[PDB]
UniProtKB/Swiss-Prot annotation, chain C:
Species, as recorded: Saccharomyces cerevisiae (strain ATCC 204508 / S288c) (Baker's yeast)
Cofactor note: Binds 1 zinc ion per monomer.
Protein's job: Catalyzes an early step in the biosynthesis of tetrapyrroles. Binds two molecules of 5-aminolevulinate per subunit, each at a distinct site, and catalyzes their condensation to form porphobilinogen.
Signal peptide residues on this chain, from the entry's feature table: none
Entry keyword set: Heme biosynthesis, Lyase, Metal-binding, Phosphoprotein, Porphyrin biosynthesis, Zinc
Subunit structure, as described in the record: Homooctamer.
Binding sites annotated in the UniProt record for 5-aminolevulinate 2: S130, Y169
Any one GO biological process: protoporphyrinogen IX biosynthetic process
Name of the encoding gene: HEM2
Full protein name: Delta-aminolevulinic acid dehydratase
Active site: K64 (schiff-base intermediate with substrate), K103 (schiff-base intermediate with substrate)
Catalytic activity: 2 5-aminolevulinate = porphobilinogen + 2 H2O + H(+)
């Protein structure tokens, strides 16, 4: 009858023995290239035209569309818990603001520039980052100024984006993150900051590698998912043009790209961006009990760190600010 | 009143212009390091003790636990559609088979060895891969032979695993995939195949980098998620010990690791493993409409390819065998 | 040896035993600091034979230099010995070390940087030596510098140089300061 | 009872044997990438407005603030003992010289330019290096020309620094060492020397990596201690902009940085700068008997050499000029 067979083997080779390196819970921390701190997280903020706003957005999120009047009660618990940075997204709702040139982009009385002025007065501890694009301010909804019924007009889009970027910095934003993906915008935004004498105090956080996908919502310059060479050339371009830091978006599905950015842009801080759709997919899976949210969030976020990122833009900051306390 | 500002800029630099490289749908295929073919997919198969079985497993899957008697109706549509490989997982259910030495592992009349004998007679076109471990055959459920109430006994586990591996090859399995993660098993399995004169015809598909996570089920040698250095040393060990191919599991959350394996193990075929929990998380998200399954499956699977893999073990093969037809 | 040098064979054979005995008594990790050629291999082999290899982290003092940092005033690299330090780092990893130590640290930051590239996949550890610790304290009391200030600078230096672990006599303090 | 245990071991491997390489005192010299010569040391000199000066400064030093009238008796013993280079630091004391534009910086009758004229007449053997900055000549004490109650005005500071640098060279200084840390100063100083036809005879010794710390005194552009990527990009910038040599300051606490500069700037002479605070900390420790000064000075200074430097700016030159004799 069937009996357990045991082949004979040679003595163990030391080169085969890796196990003494990870056997204790502590050795598991010892084994990581970098550990998750609270000053690494960056919380996205969606500021509304309506100063009293605080409207729930939806997918699987727990994120809102707040207004300058509710902004102080929302950032207080966060700041006290250790939050050190936020990235600003303006959401102009008033019936007659959006246009073909994204005019409302640097509107001194828009959500963003008013979000900046409020934060720097009530939370001078917070590092202000601002997303730079025209998608949310143009009537068409594209990332830049279009040509008559066609493609994006590179020259006008960039020239426009440089202005918005310099205006946020002039209003007090410590950092501008351009997310248009339009060729050469980093150079013009950097040159514009230089001419505006704000280059030495505004960190240009480039979304160097922003891919298109089904991670933004079920269903303009944007790398195709298989585009690794373009992503690498875009990383290198953006650093040569002046970027002081780089962003990879999405992150979990593009970990190899963050690893590439970690070698191409070795001397610059890399940032991973946990996209709404990834966040909303972790939440869903969680509720369907396919996985445990806290468990899948630490795994996913340690992945950014392991892949090479030292900064993470995520909608899970509120939570993490809790969990890292533990 | 607020008017759109447009900074003045210098002429465009050619080095900033990448866009001519991705503007047409075709250029998006042109831009990929490698494209998804049907002979790249590997379908996992769970073979039951009960020869008539065909029991639905559950998370979000559409995968079953079939028996030798239903195996022909299940692989027919698949094989005709282009499926070229399968990886065998035996599931011994009979009330008195599991034990401390995983005796039933190479049981000539077990699910696996009978799954091999059936396939090689009804589908001699199919490439047979077999997972090699003792977790599913030991009373304790661990990946190897334990010590009296303690850790895993390296020597006995490996000596046991080498035997199971040589027995599957002797039964006709073209490839053995060891997934124990036990130090030096690749060497003993390779030596054992050599002594059994089966080394020149059995491809050792090593699960070189198998991390522990919440991707196997909501909630033994296994790399910790942040363990990049261990993963790299394990990749290099396994190739020096004889692996002919490598597997990274999970895949989507470990794309940077597949990218590392693509450089450490450059001359060997890399394989990504879309884990049950990732599969079950794509399905969930899909049904909650956070994303479109087909869309999120192509994105995720092209990610393996972009990250460096040329083979993919996924539960989405049935589907892909359809989609690639289109 | 009788009135002479160190007897490699007996020293190593002896050191392997001590190392396996600490592990058998419950020590999670053994750090060999003799600097004697091949001890890592025998200590690793001995742990293997004692079935304790998979649970004992061998933290090798791969690069231990001789200096005036141990006390005012046997295998030990000479301060200018960079090539030996690099070959010793590589030897110790091939022989089984799971982690590496560089001692001293502040005066050997370039060596920790070298270990960070030679031993890239292994945890590097810096060792703030008694004499460095005692020199930071002295300087402090003479007001040449501010202890907390010079301790963060020096210890961030280990981190910047490549270390992810630090053996220091300033832990009590740091356990306070990082709270802040 | 407890008896000495001796495990049995295998024969020694040759790859384990390094000891035959360092067993004799001579082999310890043989083992160094480079040895300390006297023409490697650079002695800092602090020249006072008061021509008869010779005021002891204090920390732990033995360095003074001399004046042109005492300069000949001070450099004589040094020069005869082998000193070949000095770096000039002007110290304007007269009650109404310092201002917002560092006007006195290139004052033809200031300490520096008069220190240059004196040395080139009494010691034409000496290589004259001059520190280039405005900190010691501006009323504010900052490294450059400020903006109205704010940050440093890049454009005016650099434009000013280029002039000072060209004026020292025009007065006879063989080398200018800019220590402001202001972005792009090397390029303007190099361009200015070119336009002044002095580029082919003035060595630009850039303080490429100057970090801020508690090593200058118990307690403007300056890299933060953990800033390795910035230090590396600054090293590369400065060489592309024209630096002929590089300086890393401080040195002992930044040995890894000198090692990085040794690879980034491989074809250029690297220089370590033993800072006042390090010098003053070696002296203190010495007097408290924590260590032996001569012993700790050779160790520390051989460290610069091992780390990659071929030049050392230190306050221990007088001593070394003695010790190397032995
Ligand atoms: Zn946009
Ligand atoms: Zn669009
Ligand atoms: Zn298993
Ligand atoms: Zn287990
Ligand atoms: Zn200065
Ligand atoms: Zn200052």
């Amino acid at each position: 009858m069937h009996t357990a067979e045991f082949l004979e083997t040679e003595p163990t080779e030391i080169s085969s023995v890796l196990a003494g390196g990870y056997n204790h819970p502590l050795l598991r921390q010892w084994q990581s290239e970098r550990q998750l701190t609270k000053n690494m997280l960056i919380f996205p903020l969606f500021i509304s035209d309506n100063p009293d706003d605080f409207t729930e957005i939806d997918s699987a999120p727990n994120i809102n569309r707040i207004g300058v009047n509710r902004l102080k009660d929302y950032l207080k618990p966060l700041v006290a818990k250790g939050l050190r940075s936020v990235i600003l997204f303006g959401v102009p709702l008033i019936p007659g603001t959006k246009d073909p040139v994204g005019t409302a982009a640097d509107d001194p009385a828009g959500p963003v520039i008013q979000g900046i002025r409020f934060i720097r007065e009530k939370f001078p501890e917070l590092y202000i980052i601002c997303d730079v694009c025209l998608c949310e301010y143009t009537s068409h909804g594209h990332c830049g100024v279009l040509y008559d019924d066609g493609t994006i007009n590179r020259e006008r889009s960039v020239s426009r984006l440089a202005a918005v970027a310099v205006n946020y910095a002039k209003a007090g934003a410590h950092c501008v993150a351009p997310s248009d993906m339009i060729d050469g915008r980093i150079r013009d935004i950097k040159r514009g900051l230089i001419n505006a004498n704000l280059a030495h105090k505004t960190f240009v956080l480039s979304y160097a590698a922003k891919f298109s996908g089904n991670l933004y919502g079920p269903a303009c310059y944007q790398l195709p998912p298989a585009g690794r060479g373009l992503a690498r050339r875009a990383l290198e371009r953006d650093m040569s043009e002046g970027a002081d830091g780089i962003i990879v978006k999405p992150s979990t599905f593009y970990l190899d790209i963050v690893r590439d950015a970690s070698e191409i842009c070795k001397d610059l801080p890399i940032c991973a961006y946990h996209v709404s759709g990834e966040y909303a997919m972790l939440h869903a899976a969680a509720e369907k009990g396919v996985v445990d949210l806290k468990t899948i969030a630490f795994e996913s976020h340690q992945g950014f760190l392991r892949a090479g990122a030292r900064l993470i833009i995520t909608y899970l900051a509120p939570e993490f600010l809790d969990w890292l306390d533990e």
